[PDB]
Amino acid sequence: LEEISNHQGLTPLKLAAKEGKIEIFRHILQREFSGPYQPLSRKFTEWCYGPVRVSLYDLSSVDSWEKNSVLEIIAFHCKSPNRHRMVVLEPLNKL
Amino acid sequence: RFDRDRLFSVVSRGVPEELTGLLEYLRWNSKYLTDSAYTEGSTGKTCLMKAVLNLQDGVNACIMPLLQIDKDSGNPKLLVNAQCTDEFYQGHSALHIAIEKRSLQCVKLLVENGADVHLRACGRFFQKHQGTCFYFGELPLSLAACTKQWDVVTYLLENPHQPASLEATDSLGNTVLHALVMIADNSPENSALVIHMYDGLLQMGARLCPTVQLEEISNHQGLTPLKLAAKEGKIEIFRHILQREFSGPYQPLSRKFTEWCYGPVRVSLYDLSSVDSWEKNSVLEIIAFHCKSPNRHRMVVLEPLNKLLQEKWDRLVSRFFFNFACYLVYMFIFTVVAYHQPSLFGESMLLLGHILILLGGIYLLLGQLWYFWRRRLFIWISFMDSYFEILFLLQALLTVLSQVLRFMETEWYLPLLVLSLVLGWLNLLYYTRGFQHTGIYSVMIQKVILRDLLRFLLVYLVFLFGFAVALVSLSREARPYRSILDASLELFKFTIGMGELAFQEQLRFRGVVLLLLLAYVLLTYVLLLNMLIALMSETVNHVADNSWSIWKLQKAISVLEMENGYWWCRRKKHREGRLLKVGTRPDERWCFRVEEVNWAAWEKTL
Numbered sequence: 001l002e003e004i005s006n007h008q009g010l011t012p013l014k015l016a017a018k019e020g021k022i023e024i025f026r027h028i029l030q031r032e033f034s035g036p037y038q039p040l041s042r043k044f045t046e047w048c049y050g051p052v053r054v055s056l057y058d059l060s061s062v063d064s065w066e067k068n069s070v071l072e073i074i075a076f077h078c079k080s081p082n083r084h085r086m087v088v089l090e091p092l093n094k095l
Numbered sequence: 096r097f098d099r100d101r102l103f104s105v106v107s108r109g110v111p112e113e114l115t116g117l118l119e120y121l122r123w124n125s126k127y128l129t130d131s132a133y134t135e136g137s138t139g140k141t142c143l144m145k146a147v148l149n150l151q152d153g154v155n156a157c158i159m160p161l162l163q164i165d166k167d168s169g170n171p172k173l174l175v176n177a178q179c180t181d182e183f184y185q186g187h188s189a190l191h192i193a194i195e196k197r198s199l200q201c202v203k204l205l206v207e208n209g210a211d212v213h214l215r216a217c218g219r220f221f222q223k224h225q226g227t228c229f230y231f232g233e234l235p236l237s238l239a240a241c242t243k244q245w246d247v248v249t250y251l252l253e254n255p256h257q258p259a260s261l262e263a264t265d266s267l268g269n270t271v272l273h274a275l276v277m278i279a280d281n282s283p284e285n286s287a288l289v290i291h292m293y294d295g296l297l298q299m300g301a302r303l304c305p306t307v308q309l310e311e312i313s314n315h316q317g318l319t320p321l322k323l324a325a326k327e328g329k330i331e332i333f334r335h336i337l338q339r340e341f342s343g344p345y346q347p348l349s350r351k352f353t354e355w356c357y358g359p360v361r362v363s364l365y366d367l368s369s370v371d372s373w374e375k376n377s378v379l380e381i382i383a384f385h386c387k388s389p390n391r392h393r394m395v396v397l398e399p400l401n402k403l404l405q406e407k408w409d410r411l412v413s414r415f416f417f418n419f420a421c422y423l424v425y426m427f428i429f430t431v432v433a434y435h436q437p438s439l440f441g442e443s444m445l446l447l448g449h450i451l452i453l454l455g456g457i458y459l460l461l462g463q464l465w466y467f468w469r470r471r472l473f474i475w476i477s478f479m480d481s482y483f484e485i486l487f488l489l490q491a492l493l494t495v496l497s498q499v500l501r502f503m504e505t506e507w508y509l510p511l512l513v514l515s516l517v518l519g520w521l522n523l524l525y526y527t528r529g530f531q532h533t534g535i536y537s538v539m540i541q542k543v544i545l546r547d548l549l550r551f552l553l554v555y556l557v558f559l560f561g562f563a564v565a566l567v568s569l570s571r572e573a574r575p576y577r578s579i580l581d582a583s584l585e586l587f588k589f590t591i592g593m594g595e596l597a598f599q600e601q602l603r604f605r606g607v608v609l610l611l612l613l614a615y616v617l618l619t620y621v622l623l624l625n626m627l628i629a630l631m632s633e634t635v636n637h638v639a640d641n642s643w644s645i646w647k648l649q650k651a652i653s654v655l656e657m658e659n660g661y662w663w664c665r666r667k668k669h670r671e672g673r674l675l676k677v678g679t680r681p682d683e684r685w686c687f688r689v690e691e692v693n694w695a696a697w698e699k700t701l
């Protein structure tokens with residue numbers, strides 16, 4: 001359902017970046033579930049030990065290897081004041 | 096088959112019965128569960144670590160039979176004592192997993208089967224550095240303390256199988272009390288819980304190690320837990336250790352003893368053992384010269400340190416102002432000899448003045464080379480705030496160089512003599528710290544402006560040079576600005592209010608030269624307006640003024656230098672406080688008496 005594209009070619013995650021909606025953008029981008037819904041995650045905790053968490057984040061719409069990706073959108077297609085708050089989220093900050 | 100991939104998937108399910116036949120396969124092959132064939136890739140991680148990572152409701156039913164199976168296999172390198180081996184996880188063990196997973200039931204099961212309580216998780220993940228790491232010390236007991244597990248700490252300390260030694264140390268020599276000081280953060284939630292964890296381990300040391308002074312144990316840097324709290328700048332745990340008071344069985348674990356209390360007035364003896372500057376590498380020397388942190392000025396204003404540094408300052412304020420008066424007399428002679436220079440009785444008095452300046456310049460050069468020799472190990476820490484210690488060395492070098500160039504008779508002696516005369520009077524501002532009013536203002540004035548003007552200067556110099564090469568190139572054609580230096584100076588004069596902005600009649604491009612000046616003026620005044628507003632936005636924040644305490648630290652650094660005397664006359668240090676009996680160890684200590692009057696705190700107890 002999140003690979004369905006509107007007439008601008010945007011998925012829900014790409015639309016949250018273009019419209020600058022940091023809270024729903026952050027939520028979709030970092031989403032983690034347990035049990036039946038694990039494949040609906042974008043974040044998978046690999047291990048946790050004391051204050052340290054190691055997580056795999058899914059880059060499907062995100063990495064700039066893809067044309068019209070989330071990084072290209074925040075940089076060049078987003079109009080909002082919020083763009084500078086979106087590039088400092090994980091995984092985008094380390095990426 | 097009972098290969099690794101069967102065993103690791105079996106112990107992950109928590110069903111013990113699927114191990115049936117593992118004994119026969121291990122014996123028939125003559126192999127052991129701690130051989131490389133039974134370990135996870137790119138590490139040393141065993142089937143027991145795989146089991147302890149997968150606890151169900153606090154326990155895994157496979158651990159007890161897996162440990163028998165190892166015990167029945169006749170292994171020379173027991174499965175509980177096997178460790179990870181790669182450069183990140185080296186020395187990590189199933190017991191460190193059991194403690195981080197918070198299972199007292201699994202800690203008991205491992206230690207009952209002979210898991211070594213003194214294994215050091217010492218690979219780079221467990222060291223302290225700027226990357227991904229988790230320092231807890233390196234030992235099971237230090238992990239249990241830093242994860243806040245009293246029941247596990249109690250079990251590790253006083254189980255009958257293998258009690259954790261409170262004297263045990265990691266690869267840095269840190270004991271559990273150094274580990275808790277390393278892990279303290281100055282937030283109220285962390286520091287209050289570290290203070291409780293520290294106190295109960297110290298109170299347990301009085302049961303378990305009754306002859307051992309756990310806070311006199313030194314790590315490989317020579318630091319006790321109190322000295323480490325000063326070097327790492329941990330004010331909350333530092334203040335707590337320094338001012339600690341107990342009643343009943345634990346009174347000898349105090350550093351503060353209330354002598355009497357009457358109304359709003361408390362009189363207390365404070366223990367100066369690691370604290371007084373009579374000892375080499377003491378807490379006062381550490382805060383002044385070995386501590387890197389922003390917190391140093393907050394540490395010198397705690398009791399007993401505040402009254403102890405005031406007592407030292409009062410004994411030395413006449414030496415401080417004698418040192419100032421010698422430097423005034425040296426700067427008077429310097430000025431009376433830099434003025435009255437000849438063209439390039441009065442002549443022999445001028446020669447005497449040059450010899451007194453040479454001797455004062457050599458004296459100050461030797462005194463500052465002795466300072467940087469003594470401060471060698473922490474040399475940047477010993478000048479980061481204390482920038483005058485460089486400016487006195489520079490003034491002394493330039494004084495010796497200018498007299499050397501004058502003996503060589505080269506006329507470049509005069510611009511060095513004049514530079515060392517300017518530095519000489521600028522260095523006179525060091526002594527403004529001797530009085531509260533001038534000494535706090537010298538701290539109010541100097542600030543974050545020095546950091547941001549060095550950033551603005553890059554923007555201002557790209558403007559200034561970019562417009563200077565342009566006005567020089569365009570002012571070359573006839574119908575100011577003769578050279579890059581002259582155009583840089585005419586463009587610089589606009590910032591001092593001396594702009595000389597005009598429609599130059601003789602230049603061919605005079606309208607474009609005027610538009611280049613109007614472009615430079617508008618861009619530069621927009622830049623100065625951005626720069627002033629940027630500085631106001633960071634520096635006018637309402638933070639309560641921390642200048643009295645930064646001045647108290649300047650007086651502390653001054654005292655701890657003056658107590659050594661001079662490079663030629665190294666003073667014998669007097670010892671602060673009195674040797675007093677505070678209790679039974681008798682318990683006789685160099686105590687220092689502080690008297691506190693505090694109506695505002697006392698009235699809340701009525």
Ligand SMILES: CCCCCCCCCC(=O)OC[C@H](COP(=O)([O-])OCCN)OC(=O)CCCCCCCCC
Binds near residue numbers: 454459462484525
């Ligand atoms: C070697 C054997 C001979 C010793 C002669 C007496 C030495 C007195 C030293 C002294 O007063 O030094 C003051 C000053 C350095 O100040 P500082 O170390 O506190 O602070 C330094 C910054 N951290 O340094 C000076 O003012 C220069 C001293 C020479 C001029 C003396 C003039 C005397 C007039 C009465």
Ligand SMILES: CCCN(CCC)S(=O)(=O)c1ccc(C(=O)O)cc1
Binds near residue numbers: 184
């Ligand atoms: C690569 C070693 C990882 N380790 C921690 C680093 C010392 S570990 O202890 O093996 C571990 C911890 C927690 C989890 C988990 O939460 O699933 C799994 C494994």
Ligand SMILES: CCCN(CCC)S(=O)(=O)c1ccc(C(=O)O)cc1
Binds near residue numbers: 354355356357
């Ligand atoms: C040196 C005289 C001290 N006095 C108070 C000053 C008037 S005192 O009243 O003798 C006193 C008070 C309180 C305690 C106590 O709390 O242990 C002990 C002695």
